[PDB]
């Protein structure tokens, strides 16, 4: 399913916007607007690729399956396993 | 830059913000959640080095709890084949060949790991020389060998053990003649100390086993071939045998002090395995054998206290039966008892330093690594009090 | 049966033991039954 | 107190005291094997600076103190205040 997934991923906290990304960056889906979603998600894709390299440095067998950054104004989510790259825009609290 | 300005910048008093940051991140990261019986355990039987050649001694490495030293003594099949062979067996992975093999010109009769050197094997032989095996070296030949002089042993050495702390070690060895000798682990060209175990004036001791109590290095217990256990003081004005025990009418074939700690002391307790199937739960301070477990027609060969259970201890049989005795559970029937196939006269039992896994030797060379039930292996907090009460029973 | 001074106390004591030992002989029958049904194995320790 | 912080941090599961990483990539505090921790902290610093650029691309007023790099073996908690970068190895359990 698609719509139910995004609905449950959004209303679980009243998230500002989430789109499903099953490809390596450059997603064409939008939740508020095309630019702030697509370019930011591609940027996230590049940095999670570099994070995968970073975690493979200590041991190549390790992989990153969970990534969150909770800062003063933003909380950003991504849970990559092979091509599923999450995005969550949310308040810090 | 270099590691000197970092000290001063740490000593600087701008660390209030860093301390608050650390406190906040730690207190927010405190919460953690999740994202989503007796059995034949293993075998060991060489064929090139383990054709007949009964097991003679067993041990585990304290530093590397996955490592076991074997000692295959008898050479009668082929005079040209190696006389003494010591095989080491690893636990981490299953193989059909021993990890490392060691060959000695005489027949190896006892062996053990080295505490100071975790890459070194020391064992006693039938001639009476203490034999080293530098595992770093690629040669099966012994690396360092003790002289067969009057200063050192000249009789079949059957008990060797290194004791002390990492910064103060002594390799104790006792031979059948009774001459105890401490060497330094690094230098064995000369006996750094030694003296001949003698009872009441002009009475030698036919030593055939020993055990040091946990912790103590100054006094220990010895089991003699003449069936009379003694206690000796290693260093002191009264160095030598200090106790006469009636013991049993048969040769002592094994001995071991208590091997547990955590509750009320039991280091005074130890077990001797005699030559007439009579193991003796029994203490140093008393002189009369506390209990005299007896059964069977054949007789025991070794007995080992559990490294973790303050009551359990194993029991060899020459009928191939290995039985574990849990005193708190019962005092008359073996708590566990199973017989290995082919009914061969087993010769040794050694418990893993974990206490969760047991080993047994064999009369044909096939060391069998047995596993024990979880309920029968690990004791409880009440187990020590129960053991105290059972001892207080009589 | 207590501090009864008369020998009738001892007689009631005898009655008390004969019923007591009726129970006790029942216990003996039980223990001998468990004995014999647990025997037949061998001589050593828990067997005999 | 530095020693108080060390005792507090070592209380956490799988944590050996407190190790703090400078802006140079050299840890000011020594708790684990030096070469491995130095290279790992250097890669950590590279990634955290490039993630700082990441966030200031669209959030030029935010500061970073939280990031969950967890694998199926261990999690590393990275936290910069301004110059001292705390790295803590913690079991996922």
UniProtKB/Swiss-Prot annotation, chains A, D:
<dbReference type="GO" id="GO:0045505">
    <property type="term" value="F:dynein intermediate chain binding"/>
</dbReference>
<keyword id="KW-0963">Cytoplasm</keyword>
<keyword id="KW-0505">Motor protein</keyword>
<comment type="subunit">
    <text>Homodimer. The cytoplasmic dynein 1 complex consists of two catalytic heavy chains (HCs) and a number of non-catalytic subunits presented by intermediate chains (ICs), light intermediate chains (LICs) and light chains (LCs); the composition seems to vary in respect to the IC, LIC and LC composition. The heavy chain homodimer serves as a scaffold for the probable homodimeric assembly of the respective non-catalytic subunits. The ICs and LICs bind directly to the HC dimer and the LCs assemble on the IC dimer. Interacts with DYNLRB2. Interacts with DYNC1I1 and DYNC1I2.</text>
</comment>
<dbReference type="Pfam" id="PF03259">
    <property type="entry name" value="Robl_LC7"/>
</dbReference>
<keyword id="KW-0813">Transport</keyword>
<comment type="function">
    <text>Acts as one of several non-catalytic accessory components of the cytoplasmic dynein 1 complex that are thought to be involved in linking dynein to cargos and to adapter proteins that regulate dynein function. Cytoplasmic dynein 1 acts as a motor for the intracellular retrograde motility of vesicles and organelles along microtubules.</text>
</comment>
<dbReference type="GO" id="GO:0005868">
    <property type="term" value="C:cytoplasmic dynein complex"/>
</dbReference>
<keyword id="KW-0007">Acetylation</keyword>
<keyword id="KW-0243">Dynein</keyword>
<keyword id="KW-0206">Cytoskeleton</keyword>
<dbReference type="GO" id="GO:0007018">
    <property type="term" value="P:microtubule-based movement"/>
</dbReference>
<dbReference type="GO" id="GO:0042802">
    <property type="term" value="F:identical protein binding"/>
</dbReference>
<keyword id="KW-0493">Microtubule</keyword>
<dbReference type="InterPro" id="IPR004942">
    <property type="entry name" value="Roadblock/LAMTOR2_dom"/>
</dbReference>
UniProtKB/Swiss-Prot annotation, chain B:
<dbReference type="GO" id="GO:0005813">
    <property type="term" value="C:centrosome"/>
</dbReference>
<dbReference type="GO" id="GO:0045504">
    <property type="term" value="F:dynein heavy chain binding"/>
</dbReference>
<dbReference type="GO" id="GO:0005874">
    <property type="term" value="C:microtubule"/>
</dbReference>
<dbReference type="GO" id="GO:0045503">
    <property type="term" value="F:dynein light chain binding"/>
</dbReference>
<feature type="repeat" description="WD 3">
    <location>
        <begin position="152"/>
        <end position="193"/>
    </location>
</feature>
<keyword id="KW-0813">Transport</keyword>
<comment type="subunit">
    <text>Homodimer. The cytoplasmic dynein 1 complex consists of two catalytic heavy chains (HCs) and a number of non-catalytic subunits presented by intermediate chains (ICs), light intermediate chains (LICs) and light chains (LCs); the composition seems to vary in respect to the IC, LIC and LC composition. The heavy chain homodimer serves as a scaffold for the probable homodimeric assembly of the respective non-catalytic subunits. The ICs and LICs bind directly to the HC dimer and the LCs assemble on the IC dimer. Interacts with DYNLT3. Interacts with DYNLT1.</text>
</comment>
<keyword id="KW-0243">Dynein</keyword>
<feature type="repeat" description="WD 2">
    <location>
        <begin position="103"/>
        <end position="143"/>
    </location>
</feature>
<feature type="repeat" description="WD 5">
    <location>
        <begin position="247"/>
        <end position="292"/>
    </location>
</feature>
<keyword id="KW-0853">WD repeat</keyword>
<protein>
    <recommendedName>
        <fullName>Cytoplasmic dynein 1 intermediate chain 2</fullName>
    </recommendedName>
</protein>
<keyword id="KW-0991">Intellectual disability</keyword>
<dbReference type="GO" id="GO:0005737">
    <property type="term" value="C:cytoplasm"/>
</dbReference>
<feature type="repeat" description="WD 1">
    <location>
        <begin position="50"/>
        <end position="99"/>
    </location>
</feature>
Swiss-Prot record, chain C:
<comment type="subunit">
    <text>Homodimer. The cytoplasmic dynein 1 complex consists of two catalytic heavy chains (HCs) and a number of non-catalytic subunits presented by intermediate chains (ICs), light intermediate chains (LICs) and light chains (LCs); the composition seems to vary in respect to the IC, LIC and LC composition. The heavy chain homodimer serves as a scaffold for the probable homodimeric assembly of the respective non-catalytic subunits. The ICs and LICs bind directly to the HC dimer and dynein LCs assemble on the IC dimer. Interacts with DYNC1LI1; DYNC1LI1 and DYNC1LI2 bind mutually exclusive to DYNC1H1.</text>
</comment>
<feature type="coiled-coil region">
    <location>
        <begin position="10"/>
        <end position="33"/>
    </location>
</feature>
<protein>
    <recommendedName>
        <fullName>Cytoplasmic dynein 1 heavy chain 1</fullName>
    </recommendedName>
</protein>
<comment type="similarity">
    <text>Belongs to the dynein heavy chain family.</text>
</comment>
<comment type="function">
    <text>Cytoplasmic dynein 1 acts as a motor for the intracellular retrograde motility of vesicles and organelles along microtubules. Dynein has ATPase activity; the force-producing power stroke is thought to occur on release of ADP. Plays a role in mitotic spindle assembly and metaphase plate congression.</text>
</comment>
